[PDB]
Design a protein around this ligand. Sequence first.
Ligand code: NAG
Ligand code: NAG
Ligand code: NAG
Ligand code: NAG
Ligand code: CA
Lengths: 383, 474
Amino acid sequence: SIEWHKFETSEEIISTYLIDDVLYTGVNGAVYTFSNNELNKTGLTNNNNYITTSIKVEDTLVCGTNNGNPKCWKIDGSEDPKYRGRGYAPYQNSKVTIISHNECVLSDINISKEGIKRWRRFDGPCGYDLYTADNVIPKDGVRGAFVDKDGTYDKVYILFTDTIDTKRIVKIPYIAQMCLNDEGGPSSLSSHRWSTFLKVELECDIDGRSYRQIIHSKAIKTDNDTILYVFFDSPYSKSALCTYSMNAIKHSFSTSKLGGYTKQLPSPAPGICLPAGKVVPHTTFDIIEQYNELDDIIKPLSQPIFEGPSGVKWFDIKEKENEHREYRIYFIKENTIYSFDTKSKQTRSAQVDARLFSVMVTSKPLFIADIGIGVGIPRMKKI
Amino acid sequence: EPVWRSEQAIGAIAASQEDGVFVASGSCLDQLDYSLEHSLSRLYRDQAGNCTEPVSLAPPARPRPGSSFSKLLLPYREGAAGLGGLLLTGWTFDRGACEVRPLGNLSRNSLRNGTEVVSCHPQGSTAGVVYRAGRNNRWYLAVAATYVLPEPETASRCNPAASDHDTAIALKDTEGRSLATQELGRLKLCEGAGSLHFVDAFLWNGSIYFPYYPYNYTSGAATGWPSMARIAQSTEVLFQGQASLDCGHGHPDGRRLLLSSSLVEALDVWAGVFSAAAGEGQERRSPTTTALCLFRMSEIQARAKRVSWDFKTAESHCKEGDQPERVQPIASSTLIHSDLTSVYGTVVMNRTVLFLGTGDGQLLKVILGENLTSNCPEVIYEIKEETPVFYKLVPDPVKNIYIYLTAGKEVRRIRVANCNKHKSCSECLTATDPHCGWCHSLQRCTFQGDCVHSENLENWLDISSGAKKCPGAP
Ligand SMILES: *[C@@H]1O[C@H](CO)[C@@H](O)[C@H](O)[C@H]1NC(C)=O
Ligand SMILES: *[C@@H]1O[C@H](CO)[C@@H](O)[C@H](O)[C@H]1NC(C)=O
Ligand SMILES: *[C@@H]1O[C@H](CO)[C@@H](O)[C@H](O)[C@H]1NC(C)=O
Ligand SMILES: *[C@@H]1O[C@H](CO)[C@@H](O)[C@H](O)[C@H]1NC(C)=O
Ligand SMILES: [Ca+2]
């Protein structure tokens, strides 16, 4: 059932990506590619070089951490003519959220060795460098990000969990939006910051259990709109998955008021994209940075909503054989594979003798582990 | 001598090489001819017409920094023909906006402009300088300003955003839109240290230097030692160090205010006019309250350490480590005076010449000798009304024999020396003034340009030759 394409030896998996239906697995020192059942490997500078990113710009780019000096390389080794790496890979082995739309790169990777977490857009087809304001993005970083249309303009949506320490330490999940081709600020000082950034609180409660920590997210475009699947973790024994309507979210950002701001909002609302060349006014930019959170909380769609177990690190979705517009949700833990059927609401589990890292579905579910990649699912029993 | 008067106090003065002399008074900028009598063009920045200070500023203690509406006036790209002259004009208007303009006619349109480039507060400090950096060696502007000050009403509120609340020095791209500042193109202030008052900004040896001093604008007192910040001449901010300037020589309580700044380029030595507190009105005045100190730039560069004290660093918080090193100002080169307010230094023949301004309208002149030793100052000019001299003494770019004296609402064109006052060869060359020389053919002491020169004769007797070489020499 499950066909394992084992590595030569056990590897430390750092990251996994899919571009042209090709699985790019980054390990400590090299990067593997998988397509058409064949495994190809290209070794890079072997030391403490963690390959955290594999994106598609003008060409396939693979970047690693090096020995504290981030650097990028081409798919087949090479030098990389652009000499990038600064915001394309971290200085230390860590989690990364970096995405490329057409050729525009968006990342949460630190630009310097001295912390300061930001969601940035590098100079390219969509405009020049742009970065979020101070303390906007949590030290936990961005957990998921994607590009989706809202009208005729493209927008970038990101998810992250913020920690607030007032009287108690409380975690809060959020979804933020911004225009892909946002010009930037209006001053000299704020010309390189986002001028359309807004965020809303997300809810995923079941029976008194309020999930806050976001793990992974996936956005699926359908006929009506875009459905966003978000898996949450908890310091207890369960985890949970909630779905959200992107149409409902867009409506909220578009019509909901700003928490803390009681006065009238400007003719062109704060988080609305402007035509190419037009810049967000000062009066509008002063409101948006001081009041960037909506006075609303987004409720999840009635289905699917299921729980457990805590420790999930990745999930992916596959449509349930064109006959049903239903799905099969695959998610994994350290040594267990799970499958949730949305129609029957049944969850099965399968144990494996490997340290699982991710599930990335193409035509068939691929399971990236320390030993290699397993094509197809094993025989599963009802958990 | 020529003179130009304005209805409002002068806030900024700068002289272009080929284009006229630019002077900013209230809310207007005037392009005057070098003879200071014909205003070639004008710029109504606030409202067309009326240049009356849109608001009113009360000139505090004479030692305290003054208030102004003009914050930046810098002519650049005027070295040689082929590129065209450009002019940077900054103000407190429109949240501290600055615009790039064609160097010359003020009736022309500005090319690029941006807000929050300069301090929006009338009393807030601002000092900027243009430099070249990058692969293409593009033009960048480095600005140090007191952007944040305690303001009441939010209807006027011009303080920058929360993410920019701590920015002290920022790098701007002149060709970029809105004079854009990049994420890593700024130096931040250490918190709670109060405010920093920048006095000047200049280029020296691959770095940009910013003379300043901790200053409490609310109380009107210096909360620290005058220092200089160093940053690399690059596209992104690279903090290179901070060093304190010690010029409390003849004063028992020391001098914590820096009033004027001048770099002597051909000597690699910086001149600064330091002063102690004047009580409030002008109370504690003494023949030792102000002083002129010359610092070796190589010593400043060597003693400026990348420690976090007034500025935030990478591996140090703020003031939780080593203290900034102090630098001494070359002994015997110090000039103690009762009321100095302005300074400009250059090298003429080979001697260092220092022009000093005073609070009673005097333009003094000091010529250094052997080991940069100071002589007794000569009074070159005095203002009838006894108006304190503006902290910026600007030389004439066309004529080497002239220097622009600014005070209150007046700008005058003063000759750097009075040569004709001397009526004898020996009597004139013993004065040891590099600008003056005995013209044999006219039997008068004059400037080099006033005397006719010939390759077959030695008609103009300079100072370097000596007074003993006079025709009658005993
Ligand atoms: C213009 O000058 C008048 C004096 O006639 C003054 O009262 C007014 O404030 C000024 N108007 C402006 C702001 O241009
Ligand atoms: C000043 O610059 C702003 C953009 O920075 C622009 O909107 C305005 O038209 C400019 N003014 C002129 C006439 O140059
Ligand atoms: C600034 O001045 C105010 C009063 O004038 C004072 O409360 C404050 O402590 C001063 N800041 C410093 C540290 O100089
Ligand atoms: C003055 O010029 C002479 C050359 O005539 C040179 O040797 C000397 O170093 C200069 N003195 C200084 C330091 O001003
Ligand atoms: Ca020099």
